Every structure is written in C-alpha cells, then in structure tokens.
Amino acid sequence: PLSAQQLKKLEEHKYSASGRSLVEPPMQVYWNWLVEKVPLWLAPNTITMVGLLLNVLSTLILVCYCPTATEGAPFWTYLLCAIGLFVYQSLDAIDGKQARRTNSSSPLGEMFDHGCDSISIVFVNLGTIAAVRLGTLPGWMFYCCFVGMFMFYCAQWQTYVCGTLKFGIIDVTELQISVTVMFLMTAVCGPELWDYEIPFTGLPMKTIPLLGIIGGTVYSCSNYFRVILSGGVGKNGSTVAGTSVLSPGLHIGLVLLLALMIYKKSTTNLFLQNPCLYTLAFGFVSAKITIKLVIAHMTKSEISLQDTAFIGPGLLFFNQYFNSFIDEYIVLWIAMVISFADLLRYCISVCLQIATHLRISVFR
C-alpha cells in the first residue's frame, strides 16, 4: 500500500494546528474536567472507535425508520441520535486530550481521527436531512448532502496545500451543537414542528436551517479557497509536495460530476426514491478519496487520479449508457457493497502496515 520511501517519510511528523471558536473555552473547560476523570490505561483508538460506532448505529436506525426522508420518527430515534452525537463530540475531545498526554501520540491516531470524522460527518448530514423531512423540497436535496461532503474534502484540500490546520469561528463545534439542539427540539415537540409555518412570508420553518447552512458554507468555502490561492509553503505557491495546487480538485470534480450525471439521467427517479443508499455509496467513495489525501499530506508524496473506487459509479454509468438491461435498483446495492468492501480493505491494510512498521499495538 505504502512504498518504503513514503513509510520512511511518515516518521518525524509533527502535528500542528492553530485556531479557536466562540463556544470553545467553556466546552474546553468541560472537556478538561471530564478527561480529568478517565482511566489512564485506556487507548484513544478504542475511544474514537466507540464514538464512531455509536454515531453510525444511531444514524443507521434513524435512516432505516425514514427512507426517502419524508415520513416521521418517534421519540426513541431522535433521542438516540442526539445522545449519540453528543457522545461522539465528547469522545473526540476526550481522546484527543488523552492522546496528547501519556506520550501515546502516533501518526496512526491522526489517520483514525480523520477517517472517523469523514464517516461521522457523512452520517450526521444524512441524519439531519432525515429529521427535518427535507423531501417536500426536492430541489434542495442534492445540495445539502454533497455540500457537506465537498466542504469536508475542501477542508482536507486546504490542509494539503499548507502545513497547519486553521480553525474558523463557524467550525464543526457550532454545527454539531446546532444539530444536537435541533434533534432535541424536534423530539420534544414532534417531527411536525417544521410544518408550523412562520407567521409571515408563506415560507415554512425549514428555511431557517437551510439558509444558515448556505451562509455557513459560503463563509467556510471562502476561507479555504483563499488559503489555496494566496498561501504557499513550498518553493513557490505550489503544493508542499512540490506538485500543482489544484490536483485533488480534479478528484472531487470528477466525483461530483459523475454523481450529478447519474442523477440527471435516471429515467426512473433513482435518487428521489433511494436517497439514503445513493448518498451512502457516494459517501463511502468520497471517504476513500479523502483518506487517500490524509496519507498524502502526512507524507510528502503525490496522488493520482486513478483509484479502484470508481467501480460503483463506473457500473452505474455503463449501465446507463446501455439503455436498460439490468434494472436500476440492484446495481445501486452492488455498487454500495463494492465501495464499502473496498474502503474496509484499504483501511485494514493501511492500519496493519503502519502497525507492523511502528510496533504500536493499534488497540493495545
């Protein structure tokens, strides 16, 4: 998976990040207090795995009770989703703090953190689409899922072209707090709160979240793109690895363009009746494409625009070219299974190789 030179350059890696948000200091104190009361023999990898597992399980339950994102869900699922998201955020902060101390820091923890963040953000966006019932507005339904995907991959892309993580003021913490309070409010008042139209303008309640999302996206995107263009750490404004600045842009453009092209020529409404499966398949694809860039900027190597993850989208595209011999509902499942298996294989292989080199006993 990783060449000898890349694996050699993996060592002597210094984690560095600068930034702070509005709600950080109080929650920073809270996380410090909670981590003050954690056993010293527990490994951070177990903590992040548990957090990811809880978040994914709760989101999976909510998605299974609400296919197409237009039905309603009981108190059970919403409470479970809110608890899972809060636990995920808490465990992320706590295992970060516990890994910085007790001299357990390693390059593998960063890879686990970023992969878990990718999967968790995909599932959280799916859950927040399912809870609001954003199926009565079919126009604003591709945008939310794939802008969450695009925003996270652009955060990674900003990281690749620079050397330090830069934190904004509308970063992940506020988004997670807003989603948690939204889930709690929807649970306590019922799923029909978003059908309680605002006294004026004839616009429903759901415009209050969506607009904010768009605004946040704009702000976030702005910052990232500036660091892409004005900033450069290599011999010039070029990439830290010496390559071009806009290479992974081709990766994400290809992924999103293929998604849009398959969306627009379904002839059987592939997306509006199977949204969760579609978003999950392309989320696994983009998760692999984002984990590749993580290893790319941890090391100093160069990425290619050819991966064994376009098998799913490739099958969909080549089953759309030929008019219709296989119906477009089994091919989606095959693509999702293939993408999930490929992602799991890649992650396991990389983890095993890094463990073998660094002799760190990944779970210990």
Ligand X SMILES: CCCCCCCC/C=C\CCCCCCCC(=O)O[C@H](COC(=O)CCCCCCCCCCCCCCC)COP(=O)([O-])OCC[N+](C)(C)C
Is the CB of 37 or the CB of 264 nearer to its own copies?
264
117 among the known binding-site residues?
A: yes
Give the residue among 86, 186, 181 at the shortest CA–CA distance from 130: 186
Instruction: Choose one: 91-99, 141-149, 240-248, 296-304; the region binding ligand CDC (CB under 6 A).
Output: 91-99
> How far is CA 298 from its chain centroid?
18
Is the CB of 143 or the CB of 317 nearer to its own copies?
317
Residues with Cβ within 8 Å of 166's Cβ and at least 6 positions away in sequence, in order, are 17, 18, 19, 158, 223, 227
* Residue nearest Mg ion by beta-carbon distance: 96
Task: List the interface residues with its own copies, window 253-272 (CB under 8 A).
Answer: 265
Instruction: Choose one: 26-34, 279-287, 318-326, 339-347; the region binding its own copies (CB under 8 A).
Output: 318-326
Residue 114 appears among annotated catalytic residues: yes
Q: Indicate which single residue of 59, 223, 247, 319 sits in contact with ligand X (rule: CB under 6 A).
A: 319
45 among the known binding-site residues?
A: yes
Rounded alpha-carbon distances, angstroms, from residue 46 to 31, 52, 169, 256 = 18, 10, 29, 33
Looking at residue 140, the DSSP 8-state letter turns out to be: G
195 among the known binding-site residues?
A: no
CB 179 within 8 A of CB 129: no
Q: Indicate which single residue of 106, 158, 159, 339 sits in contact with ligand CDC (rule: CB under 6 A).
A: 106
344 sits near ligand X (criterion: CB under 6 A)? no
Residue 125 interacts, among its own copies, ligand CDC, Mg ion, none and using kind-specific CB cut-offs from 5 to 8 Å, with none
Task: List the interface residues with ligand X, window 286-315 (CB under 6 A).
Answer: 306-308, 310-311, 314-315
Two structure tokens written together for 254? 């290809």
325 sits near its own copies (criterion: CB under 8 A)? no
Two structure tokens written together for 317? 């595209």
Helices (H), strands (E): how many in the chain? Answer: 13, 2
Give the residue among 59, 84, 77, 76 at the shortest CA–CA distance from 283: 59
Rounded alpha-carbon distances, angstroms, from residue 166 to 28, 35, 274 = 17, 24, 36
Interface contacts to ligand X, rule CB under 6 A: 258, 306-308, 310-311, 314-315, 317-319, 326
Interface contacts to its own copies, rule CB under 8 A: 265, 320-322
Residue stretches of the annotated binding site for CDP-choline: 45, 100
Residue stretches of the annotated binding site for Mg(2+): 92, 95, 113, 117
